[PDB]
Amino acid sequence: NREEKILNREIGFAIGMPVCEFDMVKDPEVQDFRRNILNVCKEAVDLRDLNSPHSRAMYVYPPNVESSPELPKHIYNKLDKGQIIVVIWVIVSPNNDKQKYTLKINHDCVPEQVIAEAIRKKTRSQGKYILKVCGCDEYFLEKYPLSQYKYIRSCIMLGRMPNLMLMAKESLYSQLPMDCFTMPSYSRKSLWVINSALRIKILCATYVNIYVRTGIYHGGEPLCDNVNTQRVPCSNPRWNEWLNYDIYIPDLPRAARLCLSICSVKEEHCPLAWGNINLFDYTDTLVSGKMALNLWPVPHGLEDLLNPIGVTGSNPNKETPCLELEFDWFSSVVKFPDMSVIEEHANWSLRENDKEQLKAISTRDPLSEITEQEKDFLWSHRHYCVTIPEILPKLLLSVKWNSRDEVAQMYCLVKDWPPIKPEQAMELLDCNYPDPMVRGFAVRCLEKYLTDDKLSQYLIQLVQVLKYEQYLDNLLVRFLLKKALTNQRIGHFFFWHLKSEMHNKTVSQRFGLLLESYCRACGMYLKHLNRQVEAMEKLINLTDILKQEKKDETQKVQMKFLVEQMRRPDFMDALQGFLSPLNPAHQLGNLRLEECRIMSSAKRPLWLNWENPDIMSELLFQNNEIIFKNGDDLRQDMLTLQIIRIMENIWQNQGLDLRMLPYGCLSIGDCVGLIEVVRNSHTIMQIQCKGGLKGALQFNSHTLHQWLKDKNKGEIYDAAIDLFTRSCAGYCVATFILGIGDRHNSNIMVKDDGQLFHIDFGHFLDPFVLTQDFLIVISTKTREFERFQEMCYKAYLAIRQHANLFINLFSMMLGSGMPELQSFDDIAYIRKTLALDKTEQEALEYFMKQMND
Numbered sequence: 038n039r040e041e042k043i044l045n046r047e048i049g050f051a052i053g054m055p056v057c058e059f060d061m062v063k064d065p066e067v068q069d070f071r072r073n074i075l076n077v078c079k080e081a082v083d084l085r086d087l088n089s090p091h092s093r094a095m096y097v098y099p100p101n102v103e104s105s106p107e108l109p110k111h112i113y114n115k116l117d118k119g120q121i122i123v124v125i126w127v128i129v130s131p132n133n134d135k136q137k138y139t140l141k142i143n144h145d146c147v148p149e150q151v152i153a154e155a156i157r158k159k160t161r162s163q164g165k166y167i168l169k170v171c172g173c174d175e176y177f178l179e180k181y182p183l184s185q186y187k188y189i190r191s192c193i194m195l196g197r198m199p200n201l202m203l204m205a206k207e208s209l210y211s212q213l214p215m216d217c218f219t220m221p222s223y224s225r226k227s228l229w230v231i232n233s234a235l236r237i238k239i240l241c242a243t244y245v246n247i248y249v250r251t252g253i254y255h256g257g258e259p260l261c262d263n264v265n266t267q268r269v270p271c272s273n274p275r276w277n278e279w280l281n282y283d284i285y286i287p288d289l290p291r292a293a294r295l296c297l298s299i300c301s302v303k304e305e306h307c308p309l310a311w312g313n314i315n316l317f318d319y320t321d322t323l324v325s326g327k328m329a330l331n332l333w334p335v336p337h338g339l340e341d342l343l344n345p346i347g348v349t350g351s352n353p354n355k356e357t358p359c360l361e362l363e364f365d366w367f368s369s370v371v372k373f374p375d376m377s378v379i380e381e382h383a384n385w386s387l388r389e390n391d392k393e394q395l396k397a398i399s400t401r402d403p404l405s406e407i408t409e410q411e412k413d414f415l416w417s418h419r420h421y422c423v424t425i426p427e428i429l430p431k432l433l434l435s436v437k438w439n440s441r442d443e444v445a446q447m448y449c450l451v452k453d454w455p456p457i458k459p460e461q462a463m464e465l466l467d468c469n470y471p472d473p474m475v476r477g478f479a480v481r482c483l484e485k486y487l488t489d490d491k492l493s494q495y496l497i498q499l500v501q502v503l504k505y506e507q508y509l510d511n512l513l514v515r516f517l518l519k520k521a522l523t524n525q526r527i528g529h530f531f532f533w534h535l536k537s538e539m540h541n542k543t544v545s546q547r548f549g550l551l552l553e554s555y556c557r558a559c560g561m562y563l564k565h566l567n568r569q570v571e572a573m574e575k576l577i578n579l580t581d582i583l584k585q586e587k588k589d590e591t592q593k594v595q596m597k598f599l600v601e602q603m604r605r606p607d608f609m610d611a612l613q614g615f616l617s618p619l620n621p622a623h624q625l626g627n628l629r630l631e632e633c634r635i636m637s638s639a640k641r642p643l644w645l646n647w648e649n650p651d652i653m654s655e656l657l658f659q660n661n662e663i664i665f666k667n668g669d670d671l672r673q674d675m676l677t678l679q680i681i682r683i684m685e686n687i688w689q690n691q692g693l694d695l696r697m698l699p700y701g702c703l704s705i706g707d708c709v710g711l712i713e714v715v716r717n718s719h720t721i722m723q724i725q726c727k728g729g730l731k732g733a734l735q736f737n738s739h740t741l742h743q744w745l746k747d748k749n750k751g752e753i754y755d756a757a758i759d760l761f762t763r764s765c766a767g768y769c770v771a772t773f774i775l776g777i778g779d780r781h782n783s784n785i786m787v788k789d790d791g792q793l794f795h796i797d798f799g800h801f802l803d804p805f806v807l808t809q810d811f812l813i814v815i816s817t818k819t820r821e822f823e824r825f826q827e828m829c830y831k832a833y834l835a836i837r838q839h840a841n842l843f844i845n846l847f848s849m850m851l852g853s854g855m856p857e858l859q860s861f862d863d864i865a866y867i868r869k870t871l872a873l874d875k876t877e878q879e880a881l882e883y884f885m886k887q888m889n890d
């Protein structure tokens with residue numbers, strides 16, 4: 038059992054905690070999860086080794102492609118009569134002489150056709166090759182049309198010219214390890230005949246330093262009124278009381294939970310410690326007998342005396358308030374009925390104006406409240422609503438989940454409900470819908486209609502909604518794990534989104550078990566991941582030192598210390614030669630210390646610089662730069678940049694070229710993160726200072742246009758201006774809709790070619806002062822500003838048509854501890870700025886008026 042021991046050491050390093058901690062967990066659900074998830078592991082491995090080397094090579098090097106092969110009109114127009122010019126590179130002699138061959142080929146050609154044409158053009162002086170992107174580990178291994186590869190479409194939009202390298206397939210396959218996933222060593226009754234009322238005994242409490250407030254909930258809604266116990270003095274926290282609720286035992290839905298908290302009185306009621314318990318365990322058994330639940334500290338800004346959206350389970354730290362409980366015990370062990378009994382009990386238990394009304398209801402947004410009249414209206418028309426599937430969320434919200442009969446009937450309706458878009462299926466995965474059948478339906482919709490591109494695009498939200506799962510073992514987690522173990526690009530960010538939260542002890546168990554399974558089945562990539570981990574490790578340590586020991590020293594003294602520590606051999610091995618967690622296709626070779634530096638003030642961010650060891654680094658970027666910041670929460674930045682990329686995608690696929698810049702930003706831990714470095718970019722303040730009339734002068738705004746004209750002389754000029762306008766327009770709309778924090782001359786940046794973008798998104802959801810610089814680069818009363826206002830109006834409209842998607846994305850992110858996103862009241866800001874309750878012309882006038890100010 039030696040290979041097993043080495044693998045366990047490596048998984049422990051990668052996860053942070055040792056694997057033997059899991060073994061000591063005497064929880065049946067934990068060991069059952071650990072064993073049962075290996076089925077998904079094995080499915081994924083078998084799919085990897087399914088087709089000899091190619092299957093593995095595409096697991097490790099998946100195609101980075103757009104979901105649709107179709108080209109937007111403006112993207113196709115940029116082609117030369119529908120064709121693209123491409124440079125294919127070949128390394129010939131052992132001296133690595135690079136020889137280039139330029140081709141003009143149809144944009145929809147397959148990599149095989151490109152290789153054929155390249156060899157034809159080369160010999161004018163079989164299928165044993167593959168195409169690599171020059172300068173990074175990205176391959177074109179699949180028979181997609183060239184233009185559908187994200188890199189190629191990017192080259193077509195940016196006017197750059199694609200530079201690919203031809204590579205013998207055997208050279209790549211020889212670099213693929215013979216992955217051996219080894220099986221771990223830890224693998225080898227009534228049915229609500231109880232026609233009664235649910236009652237629970239609160240026994241006593243320990244580690245208390247008042248009354249107990251309890252309730253029965255289904256997600257966020259309460260199935261009956263809350264029940265306060267007898268106010269007892271905190272000296273003797275002993276109640277031994279029986280609480281009876283207005284709920285019949287068989288009326289409890291599958292996902293019924295008990296939410297309790299301990300409260301104090303001054304008059305002034307204050308929560309002290311909260312807790313939540315699954316009324317049914319993972320085996321469908323209705324809990325009975327005694328139960329000790331260790332409670333959790335209250336989160337900041339808690340409205341009520343109960344935390345029902347909080348995670349379920351006993352606090353791992355057992356030296357906390359421990360509440361003792363007793364659940365009724367009946368004839369035998371009680372279990373939730375089988376779907377067959379459900380169908381039996383369901384089978385046992387219309388005007389055109391009304392149809393148009395149902396359609397209009399379905400059209401509304403998620404946050405739009407539905408009236409009780411509308412709820413009963415949707416319910417009385419629950420069979421017609423199967424013709425308009427998207428209305429399913431709202432319909433679900435109209436169910437009385439405290440009634441066995443209605444729950445069974447909705448179950449039947451779901452067993453045959455038509456599939457809906459993934460965008461709309463995700464909404465059914467947030468905290469509003471805990472019912473396992475609805476969640477299964479949403480996961481099935483994702484599994485059938487979600488390409489890996491879109492899966493990557495929404496991976497952060499999917500990982501988040503994981504936390505809303507009632508049990509370790511569920512369909513959503515199995516789906517994500519299988520996609521992660523069959524596509525390494527997805528598995529990279531899967532692993533990192535999970536690890537970045539391992540510090541959160543409310544999700545440590547779930548995410549730790551998940552990471553254990555993943556790392557066990559992920560293959561050789563584990564080693565690579567481990568390297569990344571260690572690197573971050575070192576960085577954190579270093580930065581920690583800088584923020585305490587050498588906290589109050591001068592820039593040059595801190596710089597001397599950083600160059601000293603950075604030069605320690607244990608440190609240099611750790612931070613040289615590994616993959617960029619921001620993008621694993623990017624190798625990071627040796628550190629260029631002469632180029633690393635501490636970034637102005639802040640939490641003392643590190644600006645690091647690596648050589649790019651790619652054989653042809655020069656044709657992409659010879660130096661990669663990243664900002665490691667050990668100070669502030671980056672989750673707000675991640676969500677903002679994801680939304681910006683989604684908005685740019687909408688505008689492109691709709692026909693308005695507003696080039697945004699959603700640069701990379703990855704949260705890797707508790708307030709530790711990485712940020713991409715956009716080359717050839719400067720803040721507006723840097724522009725005004727470099728252009729400062731001189732030493733002892735003001736810094737007027739009129740100089741930005743001069744700086745751009747100096748950096749873009751000749752025919753370039755107009756181009757640059759255009760770029761600047763469009764990007765600017767885009768970001769304006771973006772920042773107005775999301776309500777981003779205070780902008781200023783150092784929050785905004787421009788590149789040497791005119792592109793403008795924003796950075797550091799502190800707070801969102803709680804008016805863009807177009808400088809004279811912006812308006813004069815665009816030129817007040819000019820055709821340029823007319824086109825500018827038209828762009829902005831069109832972009833506002835375009836983003837208003839997808840309001841549901843952004844509202845759902847935020848709703849799903851609510852689960853995260855993100856401060857700027859604690860309640861639906863913060864999200865409502867988007868419903869406000871996009872004028873959802875108003876009409877289209879009304880919202881257009883609203884935006885025009887907001888933009889006049």
Ligand SMILES: */C=C\C(=O)N1CCC(COCC(=O)N2CCN(c3nc(-c4cnc(N)nc4C(F)F)nc(N4CCOC[C@@H]4C)n3)CC2)CC1
Pocket residue numbers: 636637639642664666669671674700712713714715716718720722723725726727783796797798
């Ligand atoms: C005229 C003399 C004078 O007074 N000077 C002081 C002002 C100049 C420097 O002013 C600020 C500045 O240039 N930089 C600080 C900001 N920085 C930056 N930050 C970030 C970023 C994003 N998010 C978060 N959470 N933190 C941070 C970071 F500040 F730590 N990102 C970037 N990136 C974004 C991607 O593209 C590149 C860019 C570097 N940059 C830039 C430097 C000097 C003269």
